[PDB]
Structure 1
Amino acid sequence: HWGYGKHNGPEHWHKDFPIAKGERQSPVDIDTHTAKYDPSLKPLSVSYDQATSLRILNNGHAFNVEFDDSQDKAVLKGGPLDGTYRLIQFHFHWGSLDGQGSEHTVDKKKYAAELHLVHWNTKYGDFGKAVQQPDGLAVLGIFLKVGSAKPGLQKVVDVLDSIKTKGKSADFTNFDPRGLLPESLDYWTYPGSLTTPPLLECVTWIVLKEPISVSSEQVLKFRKLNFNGEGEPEELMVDNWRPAQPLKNRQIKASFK
């Protein structure tokens, strides 16, 4: 179906998913001079102490670390959000080279990669109902730059060999996603969409200002993954990012002065 190549990449997606040309698409460029500080924005509450990771899956577009979301364990609250959003999975988008890979950009600057921690609003009961609602998801986005290693990422990098190709999964219990956060939780926020088909307009985006640093060796391991299934021709999983989309009639708000 859809993917990231010239024949099936982002510029094609609108033919099967016409919302691609919609009014609240993601990602976007964050213009730091135009985003306005909103003193009414609350601190984010990231409550991940009770997180229960279960499995890691190569789905042919990225790899997802999945959590048990059958109760209010790992949740995101506060900031621009009303109510409680449960962590369901995280994944990354990254580049073939260090100068590209993020989906959001900051003053047109691309980072090497971007982590998305995906949460759904518990008022809608299940994830499939939530993605049908304009306030159904909250995705916490964190930029990755290349520098020092991120110790809390190494457990993820070391299992990637076992899920090299599409449809492979592995047990992945006891992973603590607090080890992927930066020091500061200052953020930008705007209403947007899923960045992969079906491109549903159901996301409150919360993008942290402070990137995390990962090492060149860590990001090199992401780039050894494959988009293809086992035995099929090898296509390295790189450049699985959607470019910035028109901001249209939206305002990006900053939590910080």
Structure 2
Amino acid sequence: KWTYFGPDGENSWSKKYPSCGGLLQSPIDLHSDILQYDASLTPLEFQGYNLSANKQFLLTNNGHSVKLNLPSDMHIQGLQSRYSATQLHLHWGNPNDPHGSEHTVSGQHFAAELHIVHYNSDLYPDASTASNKSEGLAVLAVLIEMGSFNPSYDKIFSHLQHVKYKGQEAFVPGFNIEELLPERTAEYYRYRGSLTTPPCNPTVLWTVFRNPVQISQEQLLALETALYCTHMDDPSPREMINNFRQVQKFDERLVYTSFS
């Protein structure tokens, strides 16, 4: 199965997953030469993000990240179609080099990155169907850096030891997912791109917020050391670290910004 290191690592994805060597690949480096202010871009509105604490949502180690399943009643407004949530998950680096965001800003990697994945529910019945179809997916990306302890991110991180191996799952009580978002969400970069993992479908409208959120060094280290890519019975266990793709070429493409 594909990985982020060794023979089946990212430079090999295109062998089995052609789109990984096709058009509109993500992530990218967000830098002045490719940015253009677009005054018509409007603030997103997050609806249904405040999940009932009496409900529960599945957290799964899928062998590539840790993901939290999200209900289709959670959605975003401010795009041309309604997009409804399906899951969120994270990318991170490793304790020797704690810089594993997927997007970079002026060449700099943040410690980690949160993706909140939505599908076009106006056009499509579910994420699976949406994922390889035009306009299918909208992902929100939050850059994460070291700093103060984040009680909100801890509503995910405190359950990590129950999902250490691939295929393991744990239910998490609902909490307000808006608490994972940064300050001033109105300021963001927006561009057409792709899944940043196989099958790399070029069907994602990306919004990356301008402002990072902070988690503590202890939180980041927990995220970096908690998880394995492999099933509990794999003869060759692999730690889940550096699960972020290198940035892609972005030529002639432009990234639009909601801030000037």
The interval holding the TM-score normalised by the smaller chain is over 0.9
Structure 2 CA distance for aligned equivalents of residues 250 and 133 of structure 1: 20
Name the aligned partner's letter for residue 69 of structure 2. Answer: E
Could you tell me which residue of structure 2 aligns to residue 205 of structure 1? Answer: 206
Structure-to-structure mapping, 1:1-257, within 5 angstroms: 1-51=1-51, 54-69=57-72, 73-78=73-78, 81-97=79-95, 98-122=97-121, 123-185=123-185, 186-224=187-225, 225-232=227-234, 233-257=236-260
Structure 1 CA distance for aligned equivalents of residues 191 and 228 of structure 2: 32
Q: TM-score, normalised by structure 2?
A: 0.93
Percent identical: 36
Structure 2 CA distance for aligned equivalents of residues 3 and 99 of structure 1: 19
| Aligned-pair CA distance for 1:68 | 2.2
Structure 2 CA distance for aligned equivalents of residues 99 and 164 of structure 1: 20
Counterpart contact for 2:57–2:173, Cα < 8 Å = yes
Counterpart contact for 2:149–2:215, Cα < 8 Å = yes
Give the ranges of 4+ consecutive aligned residues of structure 1 lying more than 6 Å apart after TM superposition: none
**Secondary structure of 1:190 counterpart:** strand
Counterpart contact for 1:57–1:163, Cα < 8 Å = yes
Structure 2 CA distance for aligned equivalents of residues 42 and 116 of structure 1: 20
Structure 2 CA distance for aligned equivalents of residues 128 and 226 of structure 1: 25
Counterpart contact for 1:99–1:110, Cα < 8 Å = no
Cα distance 1:51–1:183, how it changes in 2: closer, same or farther (>3 A)?
Answer: same
Structure 2: runs of 5+ lacking an equivalent: none
| Aligned-pair CA distance for 1:33 | 4.8
| Aligned-pair CA distance for 1:213 | 0.4
RMSD: 1.4
Counterpart contact for 1:66–1:90, Cα < 8 Å = yes
Counterpart contact for 1:25–1:193, Cα < 8 Å = yes
**Secondary structure of 2:23 counterpart:** coil
Q: TM-score, normalised by structure 1?
A: 0.94
| Aligned-pair CA distance for 1:99 | 4.4
Structure 2 CA distance for aligned equivalents of residues 246 and 213 of structure 1: 28
Aligned residues: 252
Name the aligned partner's letter for residue 64 of structure 1. Answer: K
Structure 1 CA distance for aligned equivalents of residues 51 and 136 of structure 2: 20
Structure 2 CA distance for aligned equivalents of residues 45 and 84 of structure 1: 11
